[PDB]
Write a protein that binds this ligand. Sequence first.
Ligand SMILES: Nc1nc2[nH]c(CCNc3ccc(C(=O)N[C@@H](CCC(=O)O)C(=O)O)cc3)cc2c(=O)[nH]1
Ligand SMILES: NCC(=O)N[C@@H]1O[C@H](COP(=O)([O-])[O-])[C@@H](O)[C@H]1O
Length: 200
Amino acid sequence: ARVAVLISGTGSNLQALIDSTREPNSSAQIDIVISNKAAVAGLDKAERAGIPTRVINHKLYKNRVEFDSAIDLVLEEFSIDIVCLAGFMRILSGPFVAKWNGKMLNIHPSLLPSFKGSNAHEQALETGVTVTGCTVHFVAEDVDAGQIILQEAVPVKRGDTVATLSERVKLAEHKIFPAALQLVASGTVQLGENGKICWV
Ligand SMILES: Nc1nc2[nH]c(CCNc3ccc(C(=O)N[C@@H](CCC(=O)O)C(=O)O)cc3)cc2c(=O)[nH]1
Ligand SMILES: NCC(=O)N[C@@H]1O[C@H](COP(=O)([O-])[O-])[C@@H](O)[C@H]1O
């Protein structure tokens, strides 16, 4: 299966996906990295690995639909089968999500359904949980609500901040995002006709 990874920043999840997809038994190959922001570190990581990059600046488009449309064009150009959102910080439009239904994955730094949205660690620290974690899920139109593929729990330590907790949680993100990608690329897991997760 041919994969596009979309990023907005550092790219530690991208790097973990690059490392796993180059293992001999990997059922996924990463063919293109797309950033919505110029000059971010994930673009360097992609180039060092010999993977084509594109920047598609959301700020240059009238609305979400046109922006997603420009992404979809790249996706078709590289004949992509699966899309991974890896630190990608934009909400995607309905029809784009419908088109890639069953074929687009996201990593989110909480145990969904808790702490949806773009500041999950701040919410987790404000609420005072002692266990948080991360989630890989299929992308549905409703944000951070698609079908869950894998999760991993991570302790919150007393005195944690967003810096120290996100560092601990990323260590677990870097394990389940490659595992989930391999599950979907191999056809072991798919989005079922009834809309629930199906293990084959
Ligand atoms: N339809 C859909 N899109 C999705 N995108 C993602 C990607 C990862 N999750 C996100 C959840 C919420 C946001 C969010 O507040 N964004 C703001 C930009 C924030 C800013 O810089 O000011 C926006 O864009 O205005 C972003 C990403 C998942 C995800 C999903 O599950 N469904
Ligand atoms: N709403 C999605 C979200 O919060 N994504 C989070 O952004 C970070 C990106 O790091 P990276 O650029 O080093 O992979 C990761 O922790 C990811 O789970």
